[PDB]
Amino acid sequence: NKSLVDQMLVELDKKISAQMDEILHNSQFQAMESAWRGLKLFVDRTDFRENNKVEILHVTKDELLEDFEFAPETAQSGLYKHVYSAGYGQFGGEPVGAIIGNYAFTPSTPDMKLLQYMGALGAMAHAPFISSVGPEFFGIDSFEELPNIKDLKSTFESPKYTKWRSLRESEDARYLGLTAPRFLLRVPYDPIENPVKSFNYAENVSASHEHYLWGNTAFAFATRLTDSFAKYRWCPNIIGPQSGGAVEDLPVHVFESMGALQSKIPTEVLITDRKEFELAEEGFIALTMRKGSDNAAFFSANSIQKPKVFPNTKEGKEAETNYKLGTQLPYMMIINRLAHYVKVLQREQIGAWKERQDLERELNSWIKQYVADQENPPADVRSRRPLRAARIEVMDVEGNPGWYQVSLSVRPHFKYMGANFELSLVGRLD
Template identity: 60%
Template sequence: MPRAPPGRGGARGRRRVRRFQPASDRGKFLDMQAGQHEEPVMGSNGSLLAELLAETGVASTSGAYHDVKRGVEAVVGKVAGRPEAGAALDSALIDLWIAEIDQRLSRQIDEILHHPVFQRLEAAWRGLKFAIDHIDFRENIRVEILNCSKDDLLADFEDSSEVVRSGLYKIVYSSEFGNFGGKPFGAVISNYEFGPVPQDIALLQKCAAVATMAHAPFLAVAGPQFFGLKDYRKVPHLGDIKALFEGPQYVKYTAFRESEDARYVGLLLPRFLLRLPYGASTSPIRAFSYEEDVVGNHAAYCWGAPTYAMATRLAESFARHRWCLHIIGPQSGGTVEGLTLHEYDALGAIQTKIPTEIMLTERREFELSEEGFIGLTFRKDTDNACFFSANSAQKPKYFGQSDEGRAAEVNYRLGTQLPYVFLVSRLAHYLKVMQREQIGTWKERGDLERELNSWLSQYVADMDVVSPAVRSRRPLRKGRTSVTEVEGSAGWYRVHLEVRPHLKYMGAYFTLSLMGKLDRE
C-alpha cells in the first residue's frame, strides 16, 4: 500500500504537502502537525485524499484503484483520528505503522505460501528448476516437459481401450522411439506421489507398460501413505519393513512387483528442501519486511520430489560417460551436492533443518531397497545427500540352492537394478535404429548377426583389470548378439542380446539379456 506523508491541518492553517517519499527516505518526511479537525483539509485542487491518490500513480480506471483508495483512506483516517492534538508525526511513529502493515501482509503471505495447493505448484516448478540448473545441455542432453496432472494421466489411460492408444504412449514411444529419425527418451521423470491403493497401483502398471515398450524407465515418488503414514517423519521409527509389506493392504503392490514391467519403475523417497524460508537473514524480500513463519512447522517448508535429484545423477553420468551407470555411491556419481540447509535460532541455540525430510540409516535404506524403493540418504554435517542403491520396483526371484539356481538368482537380481536397466535400454535404442537402417537390404541372418556383434564390440573390454576411464567408455566385459528367424512370421528376425558389465556381484559375474525383433524386409 502506498505510504503517504502526514499533513498539517487547521481551519485557517497553511497546507503543506510533499510528494511521496520512498521507504528508504522515511526520515525526510515533512514534520507536520495534526489539525484539530478530523476532516481532511481541502485545497484548491480538491481534497487531500484526492491528491494522495493522485500521487500513487494508480489510474481511477485500474482494477487496483479501489483497493489503493481504501488503503489511503485508512492511513488518512488513522492520522486524523489521533487523540494527541498537535502531536508531531515523527519517523518512529511512521515506522511503527509500517511494521504493523508488514505483519499483516506477512500473515496473509504465509497463508498463501503454506496452502497445500500452492505448495504443490511451487514444488513442481522449483524442483524442475533444480534439475535444469544441474544439467549440462552442451552434452547432448534434452529435456521435454509434459504438463499433465496425475488425475488427468489416469483418466487418459481409463479412456483408452489399450495402453498403445494412450496419450503417454504416443508421446514417449510413438513420437520418438517408434518414429524414423526419432530420438528415444532415456527416462521419464515424474513428481507424482504413489501409494498402495488399487487406483495408484493401476496407474503405475500402465506407466510401467509404456516405460517397458519405450525402454525408458519411469521414476516416481513413494508417498508416506505407502507406509500407512501422513508424512515421512515416522519412517525411521517403523518396525520391521519386510513384515509391514506382507500385510493385506499391499497385495496389489506385491503383485505389481512380481511383473516384468516393474523392472522399469523406480520409486524414490524422501523429499528434499528446495528453498530457504523467506526472511532478512535467509532470503530477503525487497518489497516489504517479511519473515516466513516455518519454525516448528515441518509442512510449511517447500519440499521437492526426489525424482528431480535422481534426474541430476542421470544427466551427470551421461554427460561424463555417455551411459547412465554411475548414479549410486558417494564417489561413483550418486551424491547430490549443494542442498539447502536452514539454520535458525531456537531456545537460545542454533538449530539446523536438514535438507531431506528424514535421515535414513544404512539399515533402513537397505530395508527400503529390498521392498522396491530408492532412498536419498543425508550425509551428516554437510549439505549433500547420496543414493546408495537404485533398485527398481521389481521383486527378485528365488531359483533354489543349486549352483545354477544361485547364478540365475544373481543374474535376475542384478537385472532389477536401474543402472543396468539404463544400460540395456540404451543398447535397445541403438538396436532399434540399426534395425530401421537395415530394412530392404536383403541381408541374411548371418550378415546381420556379424554386423551387430561388430557394433557391440566397441563397448566391450574383455580384461580382468580395466582402468576407470576405459570402463566408462566400454562398460561391458563381454557382449554377444544372436539372430534367429521367427517361425511362422515371414520377414522377421529374433535378436537376443547378452551383455556382462564390468562388475562382480557377491564374487560372481552376471549377465543381462534383452530380446527383440528385427524386420527382414
Template identity: 35%
Template sequence: MSSISIQDKLKQMIPHKPAWEYRLEPSVRITYAAMNHDITQERELPFVIGVMANLSGHVDAPLPSREFVEINRYNFDRVMQRMRPRLDLDVANTLAPNAGTMSIELRFNSLSDFEPQQVASQIEPLRKFFDVRTQLVALLTMVAGNDHLAERLWEIIKNSDPQQKPEEATIDDETKSGLVTAANAADGVYLLDHVIDEATIGRDDGEKKHVRQNISTLMKEVTAGTLLITKDLEATIATRIAEIDRLLSSQLNIVMHTKAFKQLEASWRGLDYLVRQTNTSSRLMIRVLHVSKEELSQDLDKVVSNQSTVFKLVYEKEYATIGGTPYGALIGDYEFGPHPMDMELLEKLSHVAARSHAPFIAAASPSMLNVERFADISSSHDLPQTFRTPDYARWRSFREGDNARYVALTLPHVVMRRPYRPDANLIHFNESITDDSDYLWGNAAYAVGTCLTNAFAKYGWCAAIHGMEGGRLKWPNNPETGLNCPTDLDITADHEIQLANLGFIPLLYRKNTGCIEFYTMQSCQRPKMYDSCVANDNSHRSAQLRYVLTTARFAHYVRLIIAERTGAFQSRVESERLLQDWIERYVASDDTATLDAKAQYPLREAKIQVAEVSRKPGSYQAILFLRPYFQLDAPATLRLVVDLRDAEAYR
C-alpha cells in the same frame, strides 16, 4: 561375426594424440551407422531425460495437443511463459477483522514470481500496502537525522489531526485547513513544497515530487486513523511500517502455504534444480511435458493402451521413429501409494517405460509406508511387516513382474527452498514455520534425475549414479534454522537397507556436509530367487537401476539400426548378423583392461538373437543378452527384448 581379436582391440587403445586432447575421465561413446541422403554417418544418440509434471496449475489445452518441450537454463523462462502457470485461489482475508475471504488470481512467468514481493504485487490489497510501506520507508530515511523536517511534519500532522484539541493548535485555522487537504488537493502542494525547501531535501522537481508523495501518504495514514501519531515521528513511522509488515506476512503466509501454491512452486523449483545442475548439449537434453497425475491416469485408461497420448509421445514419436531420439529416462513429478488407482496407473506407466526402454522414476508417498507423514516413521518402525499385509498384495504382485524393473520410486521429500526471513526480502516477509509441514517439500525424483545427467555428462552413460561418486549432491536449500536436514525423514542405516529391499530408492542426508546421497539405486522389481548363488547375484544386480539404464541404451540403438534398414533384409539371419557385428564393437572380455579401454568396450559379453514373434508372421523381436562391466561392481547378464515389428509402420 567380427574377426577382430580382443588383443587387437586393446592395441587400438594405444594413445596417438597428445594427452591434453583426451577427456579427463574415460567416457563411453556408442554410435550406429545412420543413413542421410544415401550417405552413411556415424550417429550417437543423445541421452534425453523426459520430465512429466503438473506445471500449469489449471486446466490447460487437451493433452493430445501438447508436446514435450526442450528446456535448458537459457530458455527456462520462455518455456515457463509458454506453459502459463496460473492459480485461482480463495483464501481467508486477514487484512481486517471479520473480512471473510478474498479471491485472487496469480500468474507466473518466471521463477521469481513465486517470491513474496512478486506475489504481493499481484494481489491488489497487498500491492497497496506494499506501496504505502515503500513510501513510509523512504520518508523514514529522510526524517532520520533531520530534526527540522521532523519538527515541521509534526506540526503539520498535529494541526491536521481532527482528534487534536483546539488549544493545541499552533497555527491559524486557514493554514490548518490547507494542511488537512495537503495530501490530496492542489492547494496543499505549495505548503508541502515550502516544508521540503526548508528541510533542504529534494534536489530537483522529480525528487521533490517523490518527497511530496511520501508526505502525502503519511497524511493519508493519519487521516484514516491507521497511523497513531506521537512526537517521536521516527518511532511513529517505524511502528506503522512494522504493522504493515505484520499484515503482509500474515496474508502471504496463508496464500503461499495453500496446497495448490506449494505444489506448483515445488514442481517448478525441482525442475529448475535439475535444469541448472545439468550441462545440456546436443548429447544431453531435458524435455518437459505439462501433465497432471489425473490427466495421466485418464490418458492411460484406454481400452487399447498404445492409443494413449503418453505412449505416442514417448514410444511412437521418438523410440519407434527413424531419426527419433529415444528417452533415456522419464522423471514423473508424482507420488504413488499402495491403493488401487495408484497401482493401476503405475502398472500402465511401467508398460510404456518397458516398451520404450526408458525407466520411469517418480516418488513414493507417505501412504506407501502406511503413514500420513514420513516424519511419523520412528526408528523402531517395522517396515517389512507393513508390506506383508493384505493392503500391499497388489504392490507385491507388481514387483514380481518384469516391467517393474523399469520403474523406480524414491523417498522421502526434499526441501526446495529456504524459508523466507525478514532481512532477506524486500517486503520483510517473515514466513511462518510452525512445524515441518510448513517447509516447501518437493519430489526427490528431480535429484535422481540430476545424478543421471551428471553421470552421462561425465562418463557417457549412467552407471556411476549412486554412492559417494555419483549419488551425492550438494543441496543448496538446506534450511539454516529450524530443520536439521533437507529431507522430511532422517533415514537410519537399518531403514535404508529395508527400503532398498522393499523396492525403493532412499534419499539420505550426510550430516554436517550439506549433501544428500543415494546410497543405492534400486528399481521396484523384486529380484527373483534361485538355487544358485551366482544366479541370485545376477538377479539382484539386474534389478538395479544403473544396470537397466546402461543396457537400455543399447536397446535404443538396436531398434534404430533395424528401423534405418527396413526392407533391406530378406531374412532373419541377416538382421541378426548385422546386429551382432555392431554390438561386438563394444565388447572386450578382459577384466584387467584399463578404464579407458573399458570405456571404449563397456560390455564384457554380448549376444543378440532375432526371432519371429509367435502368432505374428513377419514380425520380429531382438533378444539381447548383455553383460556390462564399465563402472559396475560386478558384471551381470541382462536380457532385454526389443520389439522390431513396428519398424515398417513408422518409416
C-alpha cells in the same frame, strides 16, 4: 515521534508478513511453486550442450487414469503416442530415454493401476518411470517418523498392501522406480539470508514441517541420470557418493532450537544405514542425507521388482545372479541404451543384402565397440564401455525368408554394492 513511526512499521510488517505466510503456504501454490521451482532445479544442473533434451507435458494423475481406462488398451492412449509413436517407433525420430513423474503415489487402487499401466508403457517404449512415494504409503503421517517405525518388512504384509505385492512380482516392475523422502528447494525467507525487495519479511515457519517448500526427489534422480549421460554417454553411474550419484548443494536452514542451534535437515529425515538397506530391499530409492553436510546421496537405486529366490545349486545361483542384474536401474539403463541403438541402427539396414552370418559378423563387430575386456580397466573406461562380454546368436525364422532372430546377451560391470567383513587378531601369520 520517529520511534512511534518505526513501531507502526514493525506492527505493519507483522500484518503483511502475517498474510504473506498464509499465501505462500497455500497447498495449490505449493504444488505450482514446488513443480516449477523444482523443475528449474532439475534443469540448470544438467548440461544441454551435451545432447540432452527435456520435454514437458502437463498431465495430472486423474487424466492418466481416465486416459488409460478410456483407451481400449495401453497401445492406443495419448501418452503412448507421445512416447512411443512420435518417438521410438517413428522413422527418424529419437527414443525416450527416461520418464520422470512429478507425482506422489498412495496405496489407492487408482495409483497401482496407474503403475501397472506405466509399467506397460515402459515395457513397449523402453523408458523407466520414476516417481515419488508419498508419506501415507508407509502408513504414517509424514516422513519424520522413519526413525520411529520398527520394521518395514513386517509392515508391508498387511492386507492394505496386497495390490502392491501383486505389483512387485509383475514382470514389468523393472521399469518403475519409486523414490523415498523428498528434499528442500528453497531456504525459508529472512531479512538477511534470502531477502525480499522493498519490504521486511520474516517467514515464521512453525513446528509443522509442511510449511517448507518440498520438492520431488525424482527431479534430483533425473539430474543424476542426465548428468551421468552428459559425462559418459550412458547412465549406469547413479549409485554412489563418488561413482556419480552424489546430489550436491542442498539448502540448509539453521534455526533456533530449545536453547541451542540445529540444522534443519534438507531431506525430511536422516535415514540411518539399516533403514536405507531396508528401503533398498523394498524397491525404493532412498535419498540419504550426509549428516553434518549439505550434501545427499543415493546409496542404492533398486527398482520395484522383487528379487527372486532360486534353489541353492550352481544353476540356481546363476539364475538368481541374472535375475538380480535385471531388476536394478543402473543396468536397465544399459539395456535401454542398447535397445535404442539396436532399433535405430537396425532400421537403417532393412534392404541390405544380409545373410545369417552377416548379422553375426556385423552385430559382433558392432558390439566390440562396447566391450572392455582387459585385465583391469580404470573407472572411466568402465564408465563409457559398460558391458564386459557379449554373446550374440543369430538364427533364421524358418519359412519366413530374411527374417532373422537374434539373442543379444550382455554381462555388465558389477558395481560395488555391499560386503560383509570379518576381522580377527592372530599371531603366526606370514
